[PDB]
Structure 1
């Protein structure tokens, strides 16, 4: 009917945000804890969120179009709740092995190969069940066993199998500083799959996310699960205009086309407002358009830690700003016309400054206060500072020749340890091209 979407949830983090996400939509679209409609919702007309995101048993019991993969822990949390019956249990797959993922890529990967058949069956079934399949959204972790390893296989399989449909990923990058020594190795290996196998990647940096969660929301003891609440909020709102009819410019394809004009850039950073309105005991008050644009540039208040210098004076390849609520557009348009002219980023005279703006409202299936809000989606060169840091740690583990061992024992790394070297070299090329892009030199002129 709609351009239906399959969400794939992998890893602890991917399963935690993915479960929360369904919980927010169920509240928003006035349905139960198993998508059971209330009496005024069995009336004529509601928002057309339903068929892209959801499917019907057609007794008015909505079900998420979601696939769950992990082992026993995350699945066990879904089972304790009334969110097990909400989600189709065949789309949920749980496996173990006598040598499990263990938060190491190679084990997660070897297992992935064993159940290559199984995952593809699951996927084809859900695809066959689908009418007008638009594409996939992958929700996952690179601090996951599963999300990394099992995830890398699935990304490869999706690449080969179908090239026709769009593949988007929401990838969570670790919170703050190094957790294990081998982290750079785990991270580059997942990152390989993410550059090659996907058309578009939205990076969600936990460090940045965590700063907001600890400080704004206030968590005396913070955790990943707590931070994930923010991420499920960012992802859900970004889909609000898709799920809200009157928009068809909100559209995945037109957005993609405008944002991504070669497969070499495709790492997105989001920025966000509000992060206020939780546990009401402080003031909550409406911002305006200028205030909204100005907050977004700040590093730890924005969702992504790209390690920028001086709060993004860095080269923007493209900017889309999405404003939520009713507010005079005109006031903004003049101010925006001046903001491009001052030019906050950098640019070359070899390409125009392309700035896009989207306006989106709020659902009338739930009450609103019409507070000034926004999300921004931009493609920026500054993310590369992170990649350089990963590359440095990666070079250093290689050089020592030590702690290469745990990966090396698996057969894939035993036959060739050439593969890591080839990726490092490639990865230096991806960084080199992004640097060339800041200059005029980027095109034939």
Structure 2
């Protein structure tokens, strides 16, 4: 039942800082880890156990281990959260600052210091008994981050085959470094096809655009996007951090959302929210959740083929608007004839120990969709990689260890990554057809 968070790269460190701050504000833990709730009443309806370890001091240490090749960002996160995280749960490889934005250097750093991370995760798991899986926070664009993520993914698949492993990965925006960044992505994406049990997708361009829309200043800071990701992660975990009757396990959410292990890449959406009036009813909330300008990923599709959709509405809601919006969405969203037109809604309770977010009494909603829009960004990334690879052989200059000893194996690994992502997108586009399940009908 307990879940461990993995913050890879500076992006991972930032989003972990933001998410742990958000959760400490929600569960009333604060930046000092001490219980902000009085000791007179012990009755609680939340569950800080899977995310926080409570000691004899009644201090909640975040169940997270930070892995990065850059010690400065981790030291800064520690400074802003002095007395919150455990110094023993910090891993910087003891190799100094980061160097090289290729997946080779990151994966080699992971392979070299794999023993320390294994000891750390074993100690963290042995602290309790009821463990369920890990949470990985990394950017596929970051070379060291993607290398560390792939290394830990391999370690956790060949070490814990019974623990479901989900990850959060943000694809970069339309920029210049993608010519190498995409490289790392597809390599990580390769492992994402092999060992990743679940994955939530993000596109940095759409994230920046939506932030500039919701934020007044168009000069969107990366910390603001990190705050957005912390909000979406706290929202998807609301059913876990605040279970009442129905949803008390991420396994159930991945059951109702992931139909098959080959399709475990979900696109999120969250609306409306601040980062002060209510003007979006639950019906409006859901029709906005359907709107492309509220999804955390670039849609770039006229009518995406939804396979399995599931949402959680936060706020006090009446089932009448729920049913009206469900009927309207069934009239709007198309499902394949071979799959089910399943739509599920979870009523997420609000935390009484959380400071009131701006726009009070404004009902909000999060939705996770499995459609052919994730494969559109995947095709964009794979096309960029194919162009920059078949057109220019420059990747044979930035490699480490086994990848630097010979570049032909690097070319073969990149070609195999291209082949496996091609097979994945082909399986996706075939699932869009009714003839996908023709072998039984």
TM range (shorter): 0.7 to 0.9
Deviations 1:330-355 (A, max 9, x none): 55357536634774889879999999
Match for residue 35 of structure 1 among 27, 30, 33: 33
Deviations 1:88-141 (A, max 9, x none): 110111234379443221111222111011111111111111220111011112
Task: Provide the secondary structure at the position in 2 that maps to 1:131.
Answer: coil
User: What is the CA–CA distance in structure 1 between the aligned matches of 2:210 and 2:298, rounded to whole Å?
Assistant: 16
1:260 aligned onto 2:251: no
TM-score normalized by the length of structure 2: 0.84
User: What is the CA–CA distance in structure 2 between the aligned matches of 1:305 and 1:63, rounded to whole Å?
Assistant: 30
Whether the 8 Å contact between 1:67 and 1:92 is mirrored in structure 2 is: yes
Give the deviation of 1:309 after TM superposition.
Answer: 3.8
Give the deviation of 1:157 after TM superposition.
Answer: 0.8
Which ranges of structure 2 fall in alignment gaps of 5 or more residues?
Answer: 437-441
Deviates more, 1:253-262 or 1:353-362: 353-362
Give the deviation of 1:40 after TM superposition.
Answer: 3.1
Q: 1:333/1:439 Cα in 2 relative to 1: closer, same or farther (>3 Å)?
A: farther
Give the deviation of 1:301 after TM superposition.
Answer: 6.2
* Alignment: residue pair count: 436
User: What is the CA–CA distance in structure 2 between the aligned matches of 1:64 and 1:368, rounded to whole Å?
Assistant: 29
Whether the 8 Å contact between 2:313 and 2:346 is mirrored in structure 1 is: no
1:393 aligned onto 2:391: no
TM-score normalized by the length of structure 1: 0.83
Deviations 1:308-338 (A, max 9, x none): 3455444434444545433344553575366
Deviates more, 1:117-126 or 1:141-150: 141-150
Deviates more, 1:162-171 or 1:237-246: 237-246
1:363 aligned onto 2:354: yes
Task: Provide the secondary structure at the position in 2 that maps to 1:103.
Answer: coil
Give the deviation of 1:24 after TM superposition.
Answer: 1.1
Whether the 8 Å contact between 1:7 and 1:65 is mirrored in structure 2 is: yes
Q: 1:72/1:104 Cα in 2 relative to 1: closer, same or farther (>3 Å)?
A: same
Deviations 1:392-437 (A, max 9, x none): 2222222234212224564336446345445545645544554555
Whether the 8 Å contact between 2:286 and 2:325 is mirrored in structure 1 is: no
Deviations 1:349-385 (A, max 9, x none): 9999999999999979999933210000111122111
Deviations 1:69-95 (A, max 9, x none): 124444454466351421111011123
Whether the 8 Å contact between 1:109 and 1:149 is mirrored in structure 2 is: yes
Q: 1:56/1:302 Cα in 2 relative to 1: closer, same or farther (>3 Å)?
A: farther
Whether the 8 Å contact between 2:239 and 2:348 is mirrored in structure 1 is: no
Whether the 8 Å contact between 1:46 and 1:365 is mirrored in structure 2 is: no
Q: 1:192/1:84 Cα in 2 relative to 1: closer, same or farther (>3 Å)?
A: farther
User: What is the CA–CA distance in structure 2 between the aligned matches of 1:68 and 1:336, rounded to whole Å?
Assistant: 44
Q: CA RMSD in A?
A: 3.9
Q: 1:199/1:288 Cα in 2 relative to 1: closer, same or farther (>3 Å)?
A: farther
Q: 1:361/1:58 Cα in 2 relative to 1: closer, same or farther (>3 Å)?
A: closer
